[PDB]
Design a protein around this ligand. Structure first.
Ligand code: ADP
Ligand code: ADP
Lengths: 122, 237, 237, 122
């Protein structure tokens, strides 16, 4: 049904499966193959939740989170980071870089959704 | 031997590189498992082959660790036979066009000698050597360009075949040019901190070639791309 | 010096230990995909969950490689909390009952101390260490016994807490019974060559322990079994 | 066709999936958790095909192999070896030690059968 989600990942295989789980709960989703695309797609509308991963080619997840947290409309839109980097420093570099939740990869889709639910229902 | 600082980061690379496919496997499997209601046969089978394809990625990465060990033990052999090199490279080309497209890469096989080309080497290990440079060609390329290819050129040279692997991609600095063939080496740059890379591909390739009593070497500058030459004598001795 | 000969074997071991579950994963996936008609709901879910379980094993193994780097890079944390060491054992004992049973291993937790035990340590990281030995306790046992168990004895001593992990499996030749703690070290044996292992487990364990300002040592003989003592100051000085 | 298969593997999980694939074809299977069991399940009857792996606790599959090629009755019962040791001398060692065929793990169940078939219609 209602809530939108911007899903940003240089991975197609991963976008598919994250998307499948999202729409299974009603949400609609807009993909973003990278950081540039992510923001280009963003000047157009405002997602109610964002799913961002870190390592990608044109512009990375770190810079993306940055531009988010330095702008008034964007500051407030919650972000779940999905990264393969577990190193608990990376997590702080992410929360301090704006993120509202960090989730390690590999991840449980059910948990992930369980997280995506709470963040849409604060 | 700074080999002990390098194998330390080679450890974290094995980590990162294996957990990408493992992330697909878990996510897809848990999904199928939890969403039989909301899957149609066509998606089911699709998710199942995702699991299968990611497994095979993971199997190849494990094969690399294996090969390497068998090499750094001086304990691996070649079994040479009469191979039509022209097919072997194309069978190889055909074996990449997936990866190729996933990165918007055209794959080219050119011939400068006539194409029934005969050879006395091991098709398996050479097919492997091909796939190694081909891959790296796709894997290392212009992050945004329409022009991009990977070009395999067959040739004979000095009573011995000369295969070249040209890319139009991202290329390599001089200081690194000689150290790219070692165990564990990876060209670190803010440009490509992203690439899954083991740092063993070329180490396994050099070794495999230098057992056919041949050589591998490189030309490149930081803008045009890169050339890989594998000189391999028609029949060794 | 030697570290390079050992890492060359540590490679062949990442290889072997990662392809066990990968073999389960690839086989079950392919079968599901190839047998959706011959597959009854019950069986599909069973095979699906095998795939899931097998990835969770594979994930843990990868976690070790991650932990390790973060240690041999002296770059690892520790976040202390009020933990009831009494439950932190069983909450971690039951987590083993599966692996245990499939090896014919009974698992016991005894105490010589009042059992609302308080401790200011890292619950997640101690858990992991607990698991390392409980695991080796199972992973290593007399290959045919009804008698066999892995026992955790929790105890307060010297103003610190002393946890000990006893086994009626085998032990270790003295020539190595403190060589077993360094990273990459495994015990080679014609009795114990089929076991999957990295040789990081115990080195991860040590580091975690030594960072809690504690220590770990071993006492064993070639038939009775083994004991691991982990001394931990109940609250840091 | 109505042929028996003896399945030797210390892997419960792997026995289950080989067995499944085997029965999908008709063949019946007698399981065996190690080398010792493998033989005290063999004085009982003669299988038309044996499926064997290398690593296991009580007794390894290299011995088991040795013993099949030093009996008259057993000599002719074709063995497929399934090992994680793909090192192409581990295969030589296996063939010389008696086995008619070696398959590397991970294996494709379909090929495995395709191979198992080929030996059953010898
Ligand atoms: N075609 C190429 N273009 C640019 N760089 C390359 C190429 N091939 C190899 N390299 C460099 O060599 C390093 C490691 O070589 P190799 O072992 O084959 O790669 P991998 O990291 O995929 O294992 C990489 O980090 C990369 O910088
Ligand atoms: N409870 C035990 N009984 C006998 N041997 C043990 C025990 N625990 C550890 N070891 C020995 O210590 C070595 C390495 O320890 P660890 O790093 O935990 O093992 P691995 O990574 O191989 O599981 C093993 O190869 C084994 O020989």
């Amino acid at each position: 049904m209602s809530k939108k989600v911007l899903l940003v990942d240089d991975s197609a295989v991963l976008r598919k499966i994250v998307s499948f789980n999202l729409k299974k709960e009603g949400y609609e989703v807009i993909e973003a193959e990278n950081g540039q695309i992510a923001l280009e797609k963003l000047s157009e509308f405002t997602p109610d939740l964002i799913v961002l991963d870190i390592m990608m080619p044109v512009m990375d997840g770190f810079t993306v989170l940055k531009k988010l947290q330095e702008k008034e409309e964007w500051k407030r839109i919650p972000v779940i980071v999905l990264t393969a980097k577990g190193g608990e420093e990376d997590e702080s570099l992410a929360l301090s870089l704006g993120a509202r939740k960090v989730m390690r990869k590999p991840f449980s889709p059910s948990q992930f959704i369980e997280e995506v639910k709470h963040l849409l229902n604060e | 031997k700074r080999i002990d600082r390098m194998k330390t980061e080679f450890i974290a690379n094995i980590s990162h590189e294996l957990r990408t496919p493992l992330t697909a496997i878990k996510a897809y499997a848990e999904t199928i498992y939890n969403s039989l209601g909301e899957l149609d046969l066509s998606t089911l089978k699709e998710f199942l082959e995702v699991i299968i394809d990611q497994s095979n990625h993971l199997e190849n990465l494990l094969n690399e660790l294996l090969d390497f060990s068998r090499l750094e033990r001086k304990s691996l052999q070649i079994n040479r036979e009469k191979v039509d090199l022209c097919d072997l490279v194309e069978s190889a080309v055909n074996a990449i066009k997936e990866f190729a497209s996933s990165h918007n890469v055209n794959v080219l096989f050119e011939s400068n000698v006539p194409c029934p080309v005969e050879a006395y080497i091991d098709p398996t290990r050479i097919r492997q050597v091909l796939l190694n440079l081909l891959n790296n060609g796709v894997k290392y390329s212009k992050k945004d360009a329409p022009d991009k290819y990977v070009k395999v050129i067959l040739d004979e040279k000095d009573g011995g075949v000369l295969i070249i692997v040209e890319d139009n991609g991202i290329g390599i600095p001089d200081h690194a040019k000689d150290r790219i063939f070692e165990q564990f080496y990876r060209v670190d740059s803010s440009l490509t901190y992203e690439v899954p890379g083991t740092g063993l591909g070329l180490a396994i390739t050099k070794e495999i070639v230098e057992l056919h009593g041949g050589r591998i070497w490189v030309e490149s500058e930081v803008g045009k791309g890169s050339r890989f030459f594998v000189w391999i004598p028609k029949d060794r001795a």
